[PDB]
Amino acid sequence: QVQLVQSGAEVKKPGASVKVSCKASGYTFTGYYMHWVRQAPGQGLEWMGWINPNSGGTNYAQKFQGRVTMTRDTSISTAYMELSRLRSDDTAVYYCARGKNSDYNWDFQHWGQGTLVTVG
Amino acid sequence: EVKLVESGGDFVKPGGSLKLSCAASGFTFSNSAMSWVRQTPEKRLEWVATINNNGGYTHYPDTLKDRFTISRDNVKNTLYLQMSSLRSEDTALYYCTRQTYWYLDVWGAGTTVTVSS
């Protein structure tokens, strides 16, 4: 029932910026945090940050502070992740994830199909 | 209506053993984690053990790891604390506590374990 649909693949040159979208349906968008997790080809999961769509507040992993921007457009139940100054090791699939329940949003039960970003 | 009632405390000799019991009521016992906290005669509080809703996870301080064992029975709605090789430092009032996340929002009256010659 809960569905997270993301934008299509992206190809970027080193130094550019990419912005991935994540449209939510099947629940109250403002009720749950939205996390972003990326995965380089053949590598493990890497947490990036979350956004509170009810308040707009954000939180980013220190790795990406100052280089990642997370926003939300509640009117269309869509979350966005913009990553700047792209370099080769930023090549990865970028997922948006919602928590199993509002009590503990780190149990990522719902995932988007992922968005591949290839840098350089 | 939310309630915890410990039992099993008793006077014991050094090196003895005990198994404390805690009867839980007033809430869905099988959905919350539980811990044991003891209060020494000097009134110091010391967390002793934790167990999750399923019993699949447990943890203790390293000093009590080898002598204490927490367990639960989600059919009888009971929490247990097995104690062995008791020492004089184990003398205390042992509280049965319910965990919401990782703070203790429900405490029982406790039961007394006294270890001495």
């Binding site: 493990g44 999961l45 890497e46 947490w47 992993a61 997922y95 199993k100 503990y104 780190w106 149990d107 990522f108 039960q109 995932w111 988007g112 199909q113 992922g114 | 999750n52 809703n53 399923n54 019993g55 699949g56 996870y57 447990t58 943890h59 203790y60 790891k65 996340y101 990782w102």
Partner: protein, 103 residues
């Protein structure tokens, strides 16, 4: 940082065997240990939450347990569909994962 060390990095077993996957935390912190199953080409799927609770639709042959900083995922009676990579998680921290291949 909570460094989650998963061993083995890869594992190959035959159907009907048992897989024992380890995940050890460098620090003991209050959190809910989660396990994820990521099949090839798919996004991760929540497998275990709170160390030993099976997520929705996960059969009983998947068993998780934990003791302090040591966690274990046991997959009994392996099946071809169990071909996947398995990650553990505490808050933002993920292990490097165990690539479990099945013939």
């Amino acid at each position: 940082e909570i460094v989650l060390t998963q061993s083995p990095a890869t594992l190959s077993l035959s159907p009907g065997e048992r897989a024992t996957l380890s995940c050890r935390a460098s620090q003991s912190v209050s959190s809910y240990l989660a396990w994820y199953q990521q099949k090839p080409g798919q996004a991760p799927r929540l497998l275990i939450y709170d160390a030993s609770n099976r997520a929705t639709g996960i059969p009983a042959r998947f068993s998780g347990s934990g003791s302090g900083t040591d966690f274990t995922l046991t997959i009994s009676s392996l099946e071809p569909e169990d071909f996947a990579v398995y990650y553990c998680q505490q808050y933002e921290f993920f292990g490097q994962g165990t690539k479990l291949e099945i013939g």
